[PDB]
Amino acid sequence: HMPNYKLTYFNMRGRAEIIRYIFAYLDIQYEDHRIEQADWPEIKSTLPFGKIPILEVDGLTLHQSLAIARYLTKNTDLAGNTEMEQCHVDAIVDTLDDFMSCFPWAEKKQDVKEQMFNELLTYNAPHLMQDLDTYLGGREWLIGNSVTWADFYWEICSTTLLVFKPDLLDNHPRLVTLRKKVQAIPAVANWIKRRPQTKL
Amino acid sequence: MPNYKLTYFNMRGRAEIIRYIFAYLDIQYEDHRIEQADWPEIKSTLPFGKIPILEVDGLTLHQSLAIARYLTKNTDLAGNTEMEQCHVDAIVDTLDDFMSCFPWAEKKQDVKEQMFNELLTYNAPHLMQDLDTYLGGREWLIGNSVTWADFYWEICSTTLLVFKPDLLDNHPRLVTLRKKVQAIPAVANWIKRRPQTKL
Ligand SMILES: NCc1ccc2ccccc2c1-c1ccc(C(=O)NCCN2CCOCC2)cc1
Ligand SMILES: N[C@@H](CCC(=O)N[C@@H](CS)C(=O)NCC(=O)O)C(=O)O
Ligand SMILES: N[C@@H](CCC(=O)N[C@@H](CS)C(=O)NCC(=O)O)C(=O)O
Ligand SMILES: [Mg+2]
Known about the structure:
EC number (chain B): 5.3.99.2, 2.5.1.18
Distance between the termini of chain A: 34 Å
Bound molecules: the ligand NCc1ccc2ccccc2c1-c1ccc(C(=O)NCCN2CCOCC2)cc1, glutathione, magnesium ion
Helix content of chain A: 40-55%
CATH topology of the largest domain in chain A: Glutathione S-transferase Yfyf (Class Pi), Chain A, domain 2
Pfam family, one (chain B): GST_C_3
Order of helices and strands of chain A: EHEHEEHHHHHH
Largest sheet of chain A: 4 strands, mixed
Catalytic activity (chain B): prostaglandin H2 = prostaglandin D2; RX + glutathione = an S-substituted glutathione + a halide anion + H(+); 2-glyceryl-prostaglandin H2 = 2-glyceryl-prostaglandin D2
Shape of chain A: globular
Structural class of chain A: alpha+beta
Keywords (chain B): Calcium, Cytoplasm, Fatty acid biosynthesis, Fatty acid metabolism, Isomerase, Lipid biosynthesis, Lipid metabolism, Magnesium, Metal-binding, Prostaglandin biosynthesis, Prostaglandin metabolism, Transferase
Radius of gyration of chain A: 17 Å
Oligomer: homodimer
Subcellular location (chain B): Cytoplasm
Number of helices of chain A: 8
């Protein structure tokens, strides 16, 4: 049975975006609940682990953005065709998440924030882009012969990095091509044109 | 069975979850611990310059939890429903997110010590509370039987207890869960035979 899905997150792409891409690709109806800082204290206090996004499935609350994303892609063409391919997909996803999680997003000190950010973007990001390009190895998609949610996450994470470092992929045309390929998937393209425009 | 070769530092660290799984499933594997000497060298071979990696018949896999999930698919350590599987993944990422916050590599000693103390005295207790409430009076974290999330809880808490021995004083149920994991025969045997390291 098709459940009632309610996604709760801040008004931004951020960590909720991978879930939104999956819902769009699979044409799944859901409530895109974007809260305001004002209502967060209250909502926060009722969550088992106090972090968002969370996805309520028929009232049962699920947490952890990638755990949710994997759950929604189970038994779909986005998971990876084989058990091994699923491992490769899960691996690329965590490699991207690991990096994104290195940034101190809370930081209020514009300068010292822009220093931890500056180091990561200037000194570490290019190394990761190289390894991702090497991994793709001239192939059309990151894993196997068709799109997986690892490709969705690559496009999502790179879009965020590009906001702060526009020259991120100047030495990786093949990574730019993969981004465009993901962005061209009809359901994804439709979501990209319609989603609320936010900075992150 | 496939020829498995696990590569990681001589420590429990991020490879331990894989090691527990192999033990519990009675799957033979080469437990390869590298030399801090050949580290800057062997690094240039890894897919993303990170360990652990798991070689399976000439094919390389990386990312500890991706590998752990792969090894537990279709086994009794996996969740029993698609939903339980999501709960397993979420608890594991919540634990990993926290352990990943520690500056294990920080060379600046005063900075490293400030951050460790901050995480252990301020953030850690909140997580212990949330985990204890999540477990409630149930037997295991997810469902009615042990899953690899219980393994990960025991692994991560063992390391946190090294730095903060009184971490679970107000959480007897979490202590009980640790002991239940440690009491599983195959796991107990591994804990008894593994290299004794701080981390
Ligand atoms: N048992 C440790 C443990 C447990 C659970 C985890 C979960 C997620 C991520 C990491 C972990 C980990 C975990 C993994 C690796 C390291 C590590 O590489 N530290 C090296 C410290 N050296 C000290 C001397 O100076 C040079 C550096 C520390 C903790
Ligand atoms: N790895 C987790 C991280 C969850 C997370 O840290 N979320 C942040 C928002 S991006 C949060 O809820 N922090 C705000 C708070 O702790 O009050 C996930 O991907 O879901
Ligand atoms: N999330 C990853 C992290 C892998 C990781 O960062 N491993 C560390 C060792 S604990 C590493 O290879 N770093 C050494 C380096 O970057 O030179 C995993 O669980 O496998
Ligand atoms: Mg993670």
